[PDB]
Amino acid sequence: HPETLVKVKDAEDQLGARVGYIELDLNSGKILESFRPEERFPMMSTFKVLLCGAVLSRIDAGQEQLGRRIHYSQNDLVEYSPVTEKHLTDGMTVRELCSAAITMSDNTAANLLLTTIGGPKELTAFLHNMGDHVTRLDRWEPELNEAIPNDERDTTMPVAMATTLRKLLTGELLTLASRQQLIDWMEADKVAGPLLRSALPAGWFIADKSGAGERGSRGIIAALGPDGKPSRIVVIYTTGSQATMDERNRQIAEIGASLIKHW
């Protein structure tokens, strides 16, 4: 609805930064609303959904196991590892690592899983293979959040990320069982409460993943809808603001409120 674009523009005004936005119909794949849909933005922790999609694809092909246990040490821990730092002694399974990465945005979990699939270039290759020739992962955590102006490393485009997510959650790429496991992790978010979830009415569905990084970078990807089922994909990215985290959170939530009002 164009009134939502009014709010996105206002958000750019308020944050003094570019905001990229897309609304995509889950069923048909039709673009409903867009703003800077083909500009590149840092993905930040939203890549973690793609990462676990690649892992689940390996599990579907028999080349990985959800129950496989991964061992690591204190040498592997990077900033913001609230779950992995607790399990140094006995390690964690792949399943537990994807849960930690998506529901808590644990950075070391993401690194460990990236190791298991062959690094950022294999994730990039997985994406290319499913028709996303835009999204690219180049670095590991936490360097991939650097958000250098004009840097293409570790970026996506709102339209690219939206169509890739639709493919993951609805296409033939993953088994139905894996698809649902992915949705389940994203539904169980524990860190994205002040963003879209704060505008979401009672009984609606949401499966999401947020991110933050340097240079005022902030973002969220989500599948959401009334009556307990997802019917649209929304992606919002911003970078370059000097604004506080609370101010950034508020602008994204207000975009969410407008999208919901004019649904």
Rough outline: globular
CATH architecture: 3-Layer(aba) Sandwich
Q: Can you summarize the main beta sheet?
A: 5 strands, antiparallel
- What is the level 1 CATH name? Alpha Beta
Strand coverage percent: 15-25%
- Oligomeric state, counting identical vs distinct chains: monomer
Overall SS class:
alpha+beta
- Helix/strand order: HEEEHEEHHHEHHEEEH
In the CATH hierarchy, the third-tier topology is known as: Beta-lactamase
Q: Radius of gyration, Cα only, in angstroms?
A: 17 Å
Fraction of residues in helix: 25-40%
> What topology, given as strand order, has the largest sheet?
2-1-9-8-7
EC number: 3.5.2.6
Binding site for substrate: 209-211
Keywords: Antibiotic resistance, Disulfide bond, Hydrolase, Plasmid, Signal, Transposable element
Disulfide bonds: 52-98
